[PDB]
Amino acid sequence: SQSQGIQQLLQAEKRAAEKVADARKRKARRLKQAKEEAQMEVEQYRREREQEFQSKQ
Amino acid sequence: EKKEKQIEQQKKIQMSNLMNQARLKVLRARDDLITDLLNEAKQRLSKVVKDTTRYQ
């Protein structure tokens, strides 16, 4: 009978395990996503400073 | 900043060179006035030469 409770707990814990593995893996994946997004910022900076540099010219 | 400094450096060169040519231009105008004065002096000496009484 107690194996019933133990089974249900182990199954809920498997669910927790996969959910929390995704939670952790999100850090690893979004680090790369940020490594990508840096391009947006740097290119925008370059274009802006190009505009004001043209003004100076 | 380096590109802006390129533009500023060109501005400095251009202003400096223009001012220098302006300086020489004024000085050459002064030399030209002096040359005019000396040519006038030469003509006046010729006029004196025309007059024998002083020329003698």
Swiss-Prot record, chain B:
Point out the signal peptide segment. none
The compartments listed are: Apical cell membrane; Cytoplasmic vesicle, Secretory vesicle, Synaptic vesicle membrane; Cytoplasmic vesicle, Clathrin-coated vesicle membrane
Taxonomy, superkingdom: Eukaryota
Tissue expression summary: Expressed in brain (at protein level).
Function, as annotated, reads: Subunit of the V1 complex of vacuolar(H+)-ATPase (V-ATPase), a multisubunit enzyme composed of a peripheral complex (V1) that hydrolyzes ATP and a membrane integral complex (V0) that translocates protons. V-ATPase is responsible for acidifying and maintaining the pH of intracellular compartments and in some cell types, is targeted to the plasma membrane, where it is responsible for acidifying the extracellular environment.
> Quaternary form?
V-ATPase is a heteromultimeric enzyme made up of two complexes: the ATP-hydrolytic V1 complex and the proton translocation V0 complex. The V1 complex consists of three catalytic AB heterodimers that form a heterohexamer, three peripheral stalks each consisting of EG heterodimers, one central rotor including subunits D and F, and the regulatory subunits C and H. The proton translocation complex V0 consists of the proton transport subunit a, a ring of proteolipid subunits c9c'', rotary subunit d, subunits e and f, and the accessory subunits ATP6AP1/Ac45 and ATP6AP2/PRR.
State the family named in the UniProt similarity comment for this chain. Answer: Belongs to the V-ATPase E subunit family.
The name this protein goes by in its record: V-type proton ATPase subunit E 1
What's the encoding gene here?
A: Atp6v1e1
